[PDB]
Copies of this chain bind each other. A is one copy, B any other.
Amino acid sequence: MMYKEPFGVKVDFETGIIEGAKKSVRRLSDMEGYFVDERAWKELVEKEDPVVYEVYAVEQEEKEGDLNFATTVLYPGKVGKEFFFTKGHFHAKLDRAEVYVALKGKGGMLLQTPEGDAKWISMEPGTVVYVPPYWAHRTVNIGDEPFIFLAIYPADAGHDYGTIAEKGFSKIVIEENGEVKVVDNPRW
């Protein structure tokens, strides 16, 4: 019988690094067509192209019942008024749920159905978020320090980026008049 070996790994809740994980870097230039203010995007890319977020992922083969986990370090920033966020995605197998545990910083999650019905959940250290089957999810950094969290997801969930890539979320998170606001996407 083939059994896989249990393992433990240290996650630094201060940095989000998992040593030995598959590390992914997303710079702002990897995020064309994601932010409402297209000229601000282009300008911040030309002037800096900052890292928006980094992922440390521990992934299994795509098998039903098995589980992947990953930390994300989402860096502080705005493109125009719109706070830095993850690209966001549905799962390829839509009915797969997810669990997030917020570890550090201040942020939130934007979630939406295949119909564009939308929800915002605040996240501070210790907030666990239940992402139900069929909800697209995007995390947002609303602070001045990195927003770091752990996600645990079905190993066979997969990723569906395309739909969010072209249409976006139906709601957006901005800093307007010194205040964090979740408002309608004026482009959806």
Closest B residue to A18 by CB, please name it. Answer: B128
Interface membership of A132, Cβ < 8 A: yes
Contact A11 B126 (CB under 8 A): yes
In the complex, what's the smallest C-beta–C-beta distance from A30 to chain B, in angstroms? 26
CA distance A171 to B64 in the complex (A): 30
Given A1-B115, A115-B1, A152-B99: A6 touches B129 (CB 8 Å cut-off): yes
| Size of interface on A: residues with Cβ below 8 Å to B | 57
**Interchain CB contact (< 8 A) of A96 among B4, B65, B111, B126:** B65
CA distance A113 to B128 in the complex (A): 30
CA distance A114 to B1 in the complex (A): 10
Interface membership of A41, Cβ < 8 A: no
> 3 closest pairs, A vs B, by CB?
A4-B132, A152-B152, A65-B96
